[PDB]
Design a binder for this molecule. Structure first.
Ligand SMILES: Nc1ncnc2c1ncn2[C@@H]1O[C@H](COP(=O)(O)OP(=O)(O)OP(=O)(O)O)[C@@H](O)[C@H]1O
Ligand SMILES: Nc1ncnc2c1ncn2[C@@H]1O[C@H](COP(=O)(O)OP(=O)(O)OP(=O)(O)O)[C@@H](O)[C@H]1O
Ligand SMILES: Nc1ncnc2c1ncn2[C@@H]1O[C@H](COP(=O)(O)O)[C@@H](O)[C@H]1O
Lengths: 92, 90, 90
């Protein structure tokens, strides 16, 4: 499992959300941050190792303008995940 | 150490905090985030290897309702933790 | 690559930014968070493996007061980084 974190230009949030939803990705978490400043949006989603490359590609293509300030996507390893509703624990 | 990250329903924060305090945790970081919008709370706490699973389970039990939208808890490895007050590691 | 995450007293942000800038690190992400509450600032910066320890030390020295509430620095491994502007993987 991977945590995919992207810092994007705020106007690109709708396109990024759209791209992820088409991939069938659920549980997008979004926050407003300051980018060094200019307002940025941080998007975060946890995905299977099987899905992370498609997720990264989808975010990159949706968030891209080619101009300065486009931002970054960081992928981090998740060792364990628990579904709070059921208490069930998953690992890959 | 491990970074325990949970995305919970905002009204569950008090119960989650109470459970963590009972474990002797106390130090934790809370962010206001948006789920998909629905308001959510992101709780982040770095915990020793000896206690991380107990922290996960404490958060799970406290944040649980059995309803849709309860959220998830993620565990990530921390390679190095520094206490800013003293500069000590891990 | 490493993700350096620091939770600091808000008034220390400028000093931390100055230290990072002197190291040639201008790109960083700042969030307003709640620390258990008191307002805190989360600084996130992805840095190369060869520089992360120098970065951690620089942040610690700039953010330190020696008093309670100074905060924490966590270092996490980054599995992959992509530059959105070009689509290139680090
Ligand atoms: N190394 C980094 N660590 C953390 N956040 C970063 C980092 N680099 C960039 N960011 C975030 O991304 C936002 C946009 O910066 P970006 O990645 O586009 O860098 P840049 O200096 O504009 O270079 P370029 O756009 O040409 O790649 C920043 O304001 C910051 O919020
Ligand atoms: N284990 C932790 N996990 C996540 N965030 C933490 C943790 N410990 C501290 N923090 C964050 O750092 C902020 C400052 O707390 P700090 O680390 O200074 O702890 P403290 O109890 O004041 O101890 P001391 O300052 O003596 O080290 C907290 O309010 C919280 O946002
Ligand atoms: N895979 C995921 N990655 C990151 N955050 C998630 C994920 N799934 C759910 N969330 C967050 O948790 C909230 C409730 O999710 P859930 O209870 O799992 O439907 C959502 O609104 C998201 O903000």
């Amino acid at each position: 499992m991977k945590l995919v974190m992207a810092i994007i230009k705020p106007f690109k949030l709708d396109e990024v959300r759209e791209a992820l939803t088409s991939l069938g990705i659920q549980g997008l978490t979004v926050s407003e941050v300051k980018g060094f400043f200019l307002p940025k949006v941080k998007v975060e989603v946890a995905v299977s190792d099987d899905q992370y490359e498609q997720v990264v590609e989808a975010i990159q293509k949706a968030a891209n303008t080619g101009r300065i300030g486009d931002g970054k996507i960081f992928v981090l390893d998740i060792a364990q995940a628990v579904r709070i509703r059921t208490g069930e624990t998953n690992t890959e």
